[PDB]
């Protein structure tokens with residue numbers, strides 16, 4: 137039974153902040169964030185939210201589908217830790233603006249950055265159940281970091297915005313899943329959390345240690361289920377949830393040292409070959425939470441070598457915590473399809489914020505705080521940003537009226 | 547093994563991770579952050595000390611110390 141990702145599409149925001157500018161503004165050495173492998177973070181405008189990010193991520197997928205295939209989408213799962221209601225899923229808005237069938241299960245899934253993987257596994261199981269032959273699922277991981285001006289200060293350099301949309305089916309043109317090859321591990325821990333709206337709290341040091349424990353244990357569980365698997369030999373590439381690149385390098389190093397007793401230069405060559413390709417796009421958006429592992433997958437595919445089919449190992453983590461290691465295969469044909477999406481070009485055309493604009497954006501973000509009943513957005517908040525959006529067929533948040541969010545194609 | 551013995555092992559791997567501290571004095575009240583070792587290297591030090599002591603327990607059990615003296619205490623207790 138064949139199953140996996142049929143189509144993958146990314147939205148990396150309309151604007152970004154160069155972390156070297158954040159460093160200069162805090163009189164840090166420019167090399168601090170370079171040391172940690174961080175370059176830019178995507179930043180959500182006040183007239184964007186996770187729904188608009190999700191729709192912009194999914195629109196290219198839906199645009200390419202026949203009417204018949206679009207109607208085969210019978211589940212929409214939104215995976216987020218940036219929800220806009222305690223009960224209403226963002227999937228309802230997403231269905232509305234993508235024009236999907238009313239015969240569709242719709243819901244939202246939460247477990248910090250593990251949400252995307254959980255959604256993907258659920259979609260996989262729908263296909264494998266064979267309850268509805270031909271049905272497809274749309275899984276969209278979408279997150280923003282709308283912090284208002286703190287508990288969240290520790291995360292400011294790393295907290296990005298982005299969405300990745302996956303179409304899941306029995307014709308996996310992009311990523312063919314290794315069925316049953318899954319290990320998972322979780323336990324309650326207070327490493328980071330989002331206990332207040334528009335905020336985040338945490339002990340980053342605890343979270344990094346927890347990530348490392350889960351990386352080891354989720355993989356061991358996979359290894360116990362997949363006889364003969366080898367951490368170097370079985371995986372051509374490795375993609376990870378990437379809060380920032382430096383910690384993924386550290387995790388890979390820990391794994392190689394433990395499982396393969398590899399020497400330091402050997403580990404660094406293995407890192408560059410197998411892990412660095414996935415970090416390329418991640419370094420341009422920052423931590424985009426539940427979508428980050430999927431962006432890492434897209435990055436691995438665009439930036440790695442797929443002249444023969446390749447197996448990618450995937451490690452998902454979410455604070456709180458839960459984690460999963462799983463795998464699949466990408467063919468040369470799949471890589472060629474993915475390349476047509478033009479992610480690198482999309483990311484390069486975003487507006488580069490000054491530190492002054494960024495601080496103003498933080499200040500203006502309050503207008504669309506969680507719980508806002510009525511707001512009308514000024515699209516000319518930053519005229520220069522608007523010029524980079526207008527005419528591109530982007531969805532934006534126009535207004536909230538009596539809690540009802542209204543979006544516009546611009 | 548003692549709190550003071552462990553503390554000497556923490557000092558060694560700290561100096562190894564951050565060579566500019568080779569000669570500087572290290573007090574039990576010094577914090578790795580203020581020294582200032584980055585987030586990844588703070589975890590690396592913990593893991594090197596764990597491996598040196600053959601301590602095969604969850605890494606999170608070494609979290610939460612505010613300075614290297616408290617970290618020594620945390621290890622000493624395991």
Ligand SMILES: *P(=O)(O)OCC(C)(C)[C@@H](O)C(=O)NCCC(=O)NCCSC(C)=O
Nearest residue numbers: 248249290291293294340379454455584585
């Ligand atoms: P250190 O050198 O002190 O720097 C830590 C940095 C990278 C600056 C800080 O921004 C950080 O550690 N961020 C990561 C925290 C985080 O979001 N972890 C991943 C969880 S994703 C999720 C919600 O599951």
